[PDB]
Design a protein around this ligand. Structure first.
Ligand SMILES: CCCCCCCCCCCCCCCCCC(=O)OC[C@H](COP(=O)([O-])OCC(O)COP(=O)([O-])OC[C@@H](COC(=O)CCCCCCCCCCCCCCCCC)OC(=O)CCCCCCCCCCCCCCCCC)OC(=O)CCCCCCCCCCCCCCCCC
Ligand SMILES: CC(C)=CCC/C(C)=C/CC/C(C)=C/CC/C(C)=C/CC/C(C)=C\CC/C(C)=C/CC/C(C)=C/CC/C(C)=C/CC/C(C)=C/CC1=C(C)C(=O)c2ccccc2C1=O
Ligand code: HEC
Ligand code: HEC
Lengths: 210, 104
C-alpha cells in the first residue's frame, strides 16, 4: 500500500538507518542487510518478542515493543517492498492471523516440535541455553503469529525453517504444541526444631531424669 | 540411509545412493549442520573467563553429530514413516538419535 511504504520509511529512518543504512542496506559490524528479510522477519523482531537491542549483544531481551501494530505493518511493508521476502500470515480481514495459525494437530504438533526446535528450547517450551552468550527464549509470551514467524524468518542462531522445510500447515501445528503447552509454616517449623529443641535440651541439661 | 531417531518418531535421510550396477549419482546435504560453539569473547565476568564451552568447547545442545539430507522421510505422529529401500542392494544404516537413547 502506498501509505504503508511511506510510513515505513519515516519510522525506519528514525530507528535503524543506524544499523541498516538507507533502503534496508546493512551497516558493516552494526547490523545485517534487510534486503530479503521481508515482512514476517520484521514481524519476528518489533512485532515478536525479540525487538533488536541498541547495545550490541549475543542475544536480545524480547524487550517491550517500540512500535505499535499498524507501525509494525508499515515498517514491514517497507522492508518487503525494498527487499522481497516472507510475509506475516494474515487473516481474511487483514490483521496478523493468530487463531488461524493455531494448528489442528498437537500430537503431531508436538512430534514436529521435538525433532525440529524442541532441543534448543525445552520440551515444555521453557528456554534452553545455547552458543556464545546465546539462549533460546521461553516461548510462553509468543502469540501464534510470533510462533510462525520465528520458524519462517529464522531469528538469530535459530535455524530458519522455510515453508518447504516445515509446511505452512505444520508451522500452525507447531504453534499448537508451543502454546497449548504454554512466613507461618517455615517460621513455626523453625521454632519447633531450633528454638524448642534448644529449650528442651537445655532443660534436660539443667534438670534431672528420674 | 541416515536413520535419525528423535523423540517418539523416525526420520530417514538417504545420505547417499551408489548402485554397483551403475546408477544414482545422488548425495546428502552437507549444509544444515550448525554447531553450538559458545565461544563468546567474555561471559558474565569482566575478563579472563573467555569461556569456550563445557565439553570440547561445545555446549551439550550442539546437534552437530546429527547429519541431515535432502530427502527426509520424517514420520509424523499421525503418519507412520516408511523408509523405502531397493531390493537386492547393500543397504547401510547410519544410526543417530536427536534427544535420547533408544533402539532401532
Ligand atoms: C540441629 C542439629 C545441630 C547440629 C548438632 C548435631 C549434634 C547433635 C548431638 C546430639 C545427639 C546425641 C543424643 O541423642 O543425645 C544427646 C542428649 C543426651 O542424650 P542421653 O544420652 O540420652 O542423656 C544422657 C546425657 O548424659 C544427658 O546429660 P547432659 O544433659 O548433661 O548433656 C549435656 C551436654 C550433652 O548433651 C547434649 O546436650 C549434646 C548436644 C550438643 C549439640 C548442641 C551444640 C551444637 C549445635 C549448636 C547450634 C549451632 O550438654 C552440653 O554440653 C551443652 C549442650 C547444650 C544443648 C544445646 C542443644 C540445642 C541446640 C541445637 C539446636 C539448634 C539448631 C540450630 C542450627 O540429648 C539431646 O537430644 C540433646 C539435644 C539435641 C541437640 C540437637 C538438636 C537436633
Ligand atoms: C494434645 C493433648 C495432650 C490432648 C489431651 C486429650 C484431650 C483432653 C483432648 C480434648 C481436646 C481435643 C478435641 C483434641 C484433639 C486435637 C487437639 C489437640 C486440638 C487442640 C490443639 C491445641 C490447642 C494444643 C495441642 C498442643 C500439643 C500438645 C502439641 C504436641 C506438643 C509435643 C509433645 C511436641 C513434641 C516435643 C518436640 C521436641 C517438638 C519439636 C519436634 C517436632 C518437629 C515436632 C513435630 C511438630 C509439632 C509438634 C508442631 O507443633 C508444628 C507446628 C508447625 C509446623 C511444624 C510442626 C512440627 O513439625
Ligand atoms: C544496534 C541497534 C539496532 C536497532 C535500533 C535495530 N536493529 Fe535490527 N538488528 C540489529 C542487530 C545487531 C541484528 C542481528 C540480530 C539478529 O540477526 O536477529 C538485527 C536484526 C534484524 C532483523 C533480522 C535479520 C535476519 O534475517 O536475521 C530484521 C528484520 C531487523 N533487524 C529489522 C529492524 C527494524 C525494522 C528496526 C527498527 C524499526 C530495527 N531492526 C532496529 C541491530 C538494530
Ligand atoms: C538451536 C535451534 C533452534 C531451533 C531448531 C528453533 N529455535 Fe526458536 N530460538 C532459538 C534461539 C537461539 C533463539 C533466540 C533468537 C531470537 O529470539 O531472536 C530462538 C528464538 C525463538 C522465539 C523468540 C520469541 C520469544 O518467545 O522470545 C520463539 C517464539 C521461538 N524461538 C520458538 C521456536 C519454534 C516454535 C520453533 C520450531 C517449531 C523454533 N523456535 C526453532 C533456537 C532454536
Amino acid at each position: 500500500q502506498s501509505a504503508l511504504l511511506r510510513t515505513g520509511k519515516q519510522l525506519f529512518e528514525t530507528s535503524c538507518v543506524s544499523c541498516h543504512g538507507a533502503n534496508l542496506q546493512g551497516v558493516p559490524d552494526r547490523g545485517p542487510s534487510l534486503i530479503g528479510t521481508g515482512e514476517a522477519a520484521v514481524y519476528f523482531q518489533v512485532s515478536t518478542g525479540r525487538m533488536p537491542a541498541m547495545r550490541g549483544e549475543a542475544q536480545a531481551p524480547s524487550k517491550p515493543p517500540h512500535f505499535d501494530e499498524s507501525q509494525i505493518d508499515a515498517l514491514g511493508a517497507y522492508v518487503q517492498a525494498n527487499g522481497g521476502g516472507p510475509t506475516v500470515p494474515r487473516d481474511d480481514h487483514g490483521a496478523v492471523a493468530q487463531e488461524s495459525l493455531i494448528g489442528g494437530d498437537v500430537a503431531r504438533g508436538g512430534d514436529l516440535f521435538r525433532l525440529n526446535c524442541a532441543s534448543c528450547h525445552n520440551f515444555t517450551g521453557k528456554g534452553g541455553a545455547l552458543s556464545s552468550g546465546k539462549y533460546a527464549p521461553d516461548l510462553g509470551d509468543a502469540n501464534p503469529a510470533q510462533i510462525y514467524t520465528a520458524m519462517l524468518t529464522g531469528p538469530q542462531n535459530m535455524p530458519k525453517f522455510s515453508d518447504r522445510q516445515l509446511t505452512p500447515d505444520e508451522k500452525r501445528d507447531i504453534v499448537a504444541y508451543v502454546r497449548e503447552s504454554a512466613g507461618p509454616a517455615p517460621e513455626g517449623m523453625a521454632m519447633w526444631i531450633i528454638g524448642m529443641v534448644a529449650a528442651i535440651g537445655v532443660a534436660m541439661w539443667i534438670g534431672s531424669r528420674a | 540411509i541416515d536413520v535419525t531417531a528423535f523423540q517418539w518418531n523416525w526420520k530417514f535421510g538417504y545420505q547417499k545412493i551408489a548402485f554397483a550396477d551403475g546408477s544414482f549419482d545422488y548425495d546428502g546435504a552437507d549444509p544444515e549442520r550448525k554447531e553450538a560453539m559458545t565461544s563468546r569473547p567474555e561471559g558474565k565476568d569482566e575478563h579472563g573467563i573467555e569461556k569456550v564451552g563445557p565439553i570440547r568447547g561445545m555446549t551439550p545442545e550442539d546437534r552437530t553429530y546429527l547429519n541431515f539430507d535432502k530427502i527426509e522421510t520424517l514420520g509424523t505422529s499421525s503418519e507412520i514413516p516408511v523408509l523405502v529401500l531397493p531390493a537386492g542392494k547393500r543397504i547401510e544404516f547410519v544410526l543417530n538419535s536427536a534427544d535420547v537413547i533408544h533402539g532401532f
